[model samples]
Target: NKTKRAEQNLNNLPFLALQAEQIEFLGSSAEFKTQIIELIRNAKKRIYVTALYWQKDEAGQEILDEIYRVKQENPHLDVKVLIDWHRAQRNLLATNADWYCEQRQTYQLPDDPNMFFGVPINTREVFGVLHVKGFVFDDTVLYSGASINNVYLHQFEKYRYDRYQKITHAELADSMVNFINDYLLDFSAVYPLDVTNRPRTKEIRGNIRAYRKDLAQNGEYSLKSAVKLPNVLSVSPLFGLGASGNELNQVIEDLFLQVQKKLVICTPYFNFPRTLQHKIATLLENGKRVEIIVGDKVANDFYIPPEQPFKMAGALPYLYESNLRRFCEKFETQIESGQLVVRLWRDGDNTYHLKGVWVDDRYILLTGNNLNPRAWRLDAENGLLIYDPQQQLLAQVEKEQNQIRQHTKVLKHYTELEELNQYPEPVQKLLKKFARIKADKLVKMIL
Candidate 1:
């Protein structure tokens, strides 16, 4: 069953120990958002949040105001926020750093919390983003794939469904906070965006370059002299940057390579990098079960209805569907033989944003990584890889799987999916142009 091999590989990785009850699968995005607010209110020592973007929407305002109120309540509390630099500056929102400056001036709290904003990538967003997502509240860590937004937090009726997990481990939270304080905030490039005095992108070009190199080489999570617990599970925090020092990428490939009985994957996007494709192909040939659940094109966040005017951003869903069709066609034989199972998830009008890996019964990888080319080579990503040998989380795992499977449907044949000809006129024209000029390969790499 490859049990020994999984054990050997996992043992070689760095891990922090905690009891079973210390880790839990948060129910839904709504609950995840509520938990964040709850933690912010109750946090006595520290509250650290990192995400790709924090919009100036209703949910964002509510969360930010709550953070401010908490700081006002406890002047001694430590609070910090990190968001992508370019997104904050160029988002053209009223709730950015300028708004932050205004709020800080208006509130005039004794101790105002600062929001650090910047990405190491020099280019516009082509290179990468600050994709690491987690919330550290003292001794607990709330990990979610969804960012703070109206749809993400279910501020209204509709919601973007995602996976949320809460882990309580003092050492684990310390490691995450330490990585941020050491590799990110302490550097010269990253600065507080809450004040009026902020360096322009061109002004800090040299510092950004130096910080980028240092981060790529040394960004990591570590525990010093951690005491391992018995009859408890172990979780390893993995940080990934460029391909050279990407421990998260290495563990991702290993999860696929060391699988014995089955592998279950959930990704909103259908694009798999070349290495994962090869590994999946090998697993199918060796008579292992592989199940993949992906969001339908219509359920994708980038999908634009046929009636709506087309924008360049809405083409992503169609491109992903095209990729999926070709993959299903190639594996038709294996699928027919019952070795490959593919399912499409769709619910009313909501979007999908789940991403993770499950190997048989023991290993679970929770991350915001999109499992695409951009995440593998460009983005700065991180994840928590859990190795539970005694199946302490089996009940939680089963319940969550059932919840995720409620809205999915099995795929029987590749022919059932639409071809390029069935797409809308605008999408058809653009995709044909991209194909004629042979730009689809580059598009695939970046998107």
Candidate 2:
């Protein structure tokens, strides 16, 4: 009865009709980068890009140059780039905004202003970050969780693996662009990054606070109403900022409750908040099949090899592993009965960062949400909920699922994961310290 009610809820949502051939899923990071360049080069009127961060790396610079090249050719073209404001203000390892601004000046491009804007979803990165990803080129939208960086674009050897999908729909593209302009760019907290000097962290604190209040009270930055069309696969744009009741958050929760037969969830992080954990347990208790695909500790981007010097942040991978171990133990019965399947993904020497959800092969969620506490309570998240009631795209989706499973190994027992004591000395010390003070819960809340 609940499943049927949930199905009715989805049927009530506004969905736009789309052709099967209008969607394409790329398999590799290299292909994603190539397609991004092609999309930019062939863009006719507008180009809107939203990412977590645009790094100051070779690949990022090359992509920026391509955007400028097209702008140089068509001076009147509408081009805009939006990235996380908090991310833009801080430095990450070897990259910073100063270097990015310097590179933009070196491009020596035309005088088209306001091409880039930094979006501040919160006052600080710890609280949240803008985690939306999409590229609008004319009537098409290229979506992925990857940011512009060497590893993400596979500019060099190693790569951070992610899922990529392209869809051609005029209504979807227009709705995305409209949200960026009407909801985000209209705010006072947003600032242009391609200028002489970017705003400092201290200077933007008050504005960020105001923006957060605006978000909490009015819920301004949301997707427009759904477009109902007949005789096609329906897609709905979902967005979320803080806590429950938000459109995107509620949609994900409903998707889980709506599942009758099976569910497939992929996340690089193993930590699951209480709400989602309970939901999954209820499904398993009801005899529903659940498959969870996550990355091994070695494949985690935060992992540090045993031979390398360990920074304080190097313990994150082990922490996540501990969470996975606990989760597996709690669900051991389901695993033994083949009701719950957990798989760890590791490919050669590359890193992994995949995030999405599939429900009974009827609903597919394409988003940057990690399905963890941080993403649930903090990040400004958005996703495309593809509703295929007739299962018209089943073959294509099944192919993608098979490709993702090719490099993964199923876990039959919780003993397959290493405990904290088995980790390197630094990681072991950190884990023991957190455990002694019962601070592991606190750490999970933030990380």
Candidate 3:
């Protein structure tokens, strides 16, 4: 009965209709980089890019250089890049922002390409930040969890694996671009980071809260005409700022509840918010199948091998692995019955950052949400829900799934994981200290 109600509610959501041929699923990080560069080169009217942060590395500078070149070539086009304000200042203070200012000085032109930093919350990066992701090139939207950098773009020997999708619908692109134009570009709290006169976060404390409140209420996809086509798929772009009235979170819960037979999830992180855990439990109770593909601790971006010197940040992978071990321990019986299949992905030295959900055969979710508590309550997250009742995109979806499944190994037992006691000397000591001080609980909630 709950699933039936959820099904009907999900059906009532407004969506942008599109044909299957208009959507493209890219396989590798190299392909994602290629697509992004190709799209940027051919843009005629507008280009808007939103991500967490752009590193001050070879790949970052390469993309920035390309954007500036295109902007100089076509001065009439509106080119803007938005990243997290706190992340830009804190993580890459010495390098990224300085480089940004210098680049702006060098490439200064009347109304040229500029980098805008968006403040999602007034507090520190641990509390909240801008996590919305999508890049608009003319009439196309390239969606991914990967940010700009050497590893994310695979400009070097290694790369970060993520889901890459391109949707070429004028309505979808317009809605995405409008959200940027209205919520970010027009907001007072958002300022051009490429300029040397950028305002500090302390100066915009009050405005940040106001911006956050406004986004929670009004930041969403709105179509000029919301209509259902006779024989095509539909995509609804949804965003949620805080916890209350989060359309994206609500839709995710409803999607899980409405699953009749199978649900497949892909996330780099293993931690699931309480709401999703409950939905997974309910589905298992109802005899529905659930498959999860998560990145191995070795494939984690924060992973630190024993041979390397330990930093406090290196314990994140262990924390996530412990959560996964606990989950697998609880569901060992389901694993035995083949009702729940947990797979861990690892490919050489590459890291993983994939995030999405596939519900039965009717719905597909492409998002940057980590599905952790940090994403649920702290970050400003958004997602694209693809409703395919006609199964017109089944072939493409299967192809992508096969590509993802290639490097993953089935998780058979919890014992396959390492315990905290067996961790590296410094990491083991740090985690033990957190456990003793009862700080691990707080760490789990925030990180």
Candidate 4:
């Protein structure tokens, strides 16, 4: 069994001295939502919330009500809120109603003329969103990838929902907040002209619409943040939409390159960009052990379960098997050489929601980003890489395996098309359909 927190060294990180001591885990969204409310209800000093998407859904409204009630009760307590500008206003998945309310009464958006809306940082290219998922509560910090509402908070029974990780450390609290206040909040770009003009005004006209569009189009394309750790090698924070200077993207690159002995990577959404294919192929060519732990895409899908002849559950396995069949064939030499291990895991009871990687014994990466083309280009994302040479490698490996087993069932369903059972006609039909999806030369550019 793994030892408690005492086994790990928190002082190894740069800012480990200014956070709460208790490290709690909010395993489920329902539990975390309640925890957030409890914190708001009991807060006495200050509250800072940063999110990429803060819609007005069941959990979102509950959070707003709790925060507002706290502010009303304690008028002197400092209260601040931040979110991405493009993401907040864009009618993508859901409308962000929090952006349409009063800052002081309805919500706690930034009132400072220098700050864009209420966010600490403002940038362009629809980039540099406040994607960090955590809340600063006086001395406590709750870290997670889940945003508010339906799927994230799991308001409905049909959707199994997301994963929520909560870790409290004094050093993290000091460092993260310092980075936000220093580079994120102090910059003049914090109140970009595009963002400042968003406030509802008395002089409304058709010109306002044009100005709004221009402002939406204009924002800082990139941002930077720094960290000074005690024993760690290096730590830096950056945000942008590019192959370079993109902090999250760089971490992904580093992880793929730095694996010394073994690699175990898992993602709920197995959809990946083409660059990833090249990276994995390169690694396999070098004769390294690589374990890809992917959700069986079938049972974990968000679609409702089938009732009749059109069993959608059967479609999932078919879709995944079809997508993976080509890759397996393309890299047949590598598989035969025993350099790669592709594992498909799924469960009958719950959904699989994990985005993490274990590279060798030195690095462990945790991120909200799925590393897919959509996530790479459109969504605001962040990830943390823990490089600990002294940490127990076996312990980390066990932990990763435990998590995989808890949420997945590995099946030796198909090694090659010849071995596939012809029992399911739909599975066989979808298998052939996916083979026709040719990888056009323009696919990468479009993605």
The lDDT for every candidate, in the order shown, is: 0.83, 0.84, 0.86, 0.53
Q: Candidate 2 — which residues are off by over 4 angstroms?
A: 1-8, 93-95, 216-231
Give a tens-digit lDDT track for model 2, residues 23-53: 9988889999999999999998999999998
Question: Taking the tens digit of each residue's C-alpha lDDT, what string does model 4 give over 1-447?
Answer: 111221232222232211112444355667777777777788787776666666666666767677777776777666656666556656742236334353333354344222123342233423334555567776666666666656566566633445454545544555556645643443223333223245432233343334333333332212133234433322222233434345466557556765667887776655667767777777787777887766654546533343346553455544444456666677677666667766666555446556767777666665766666655554445554555455533453465467556655433333643334542666556544544574322232222
* TM-scores of the candidates in the order shown: 0.95, 0.95, 0.96, 0.67
RMSD of 4: 8.2
Q: Please count the clashing residue pairs in each candidate, in the order shown.
A: 0, 0, 0, 11
Give candidate 4 misplaced runs (Cα > 4 Å): 1-26, 90-94, 98-130, 156-161, 182-241, 299-321, 332-339, 345-351, 374-380, 392-397, 411-447
List, residue by residue over 1-447, the lDDT tens digit for candidate 3. 777878777878887778888999998999998998899999999989999889889998899888888888988988878888778776531746777888888888776446555554545687788889899999999999988999999999999999999999999999999888887665677777777777767788788878878887788888876764334688888888788888888888899999889999998888898989999988887889999999998899888787988888888899889889998888888888999999999998799888989998899999998888888888998889898889998899999999999999998888889977888889888889988988878887887
Across 1-447, the per-residue lDDT of candidate 1 in tens digits comes to 443564466558866676879988988888988988998889998888888877778998899888888888888888878887777777631547677677778788865556545555544567777888889999999998888889899999889999999999888899999988888684478877778887777788788777767777888888864433334578888888887868888789889988889999999889888989998998998999999999999889888888988897787788888889898999999889878999898998898888989999978999998898888888888999887778888888889989998899888988778899998988988888988997777888887
In angstroms, the error of model 1 at 245 is 2.5
Q: Model 3: runs farther than 4 Å from truth?
A: 1-4, 110-115, 228-231
Q: Is candidate 2 or candidate 4 better by TM-score?
A: 2
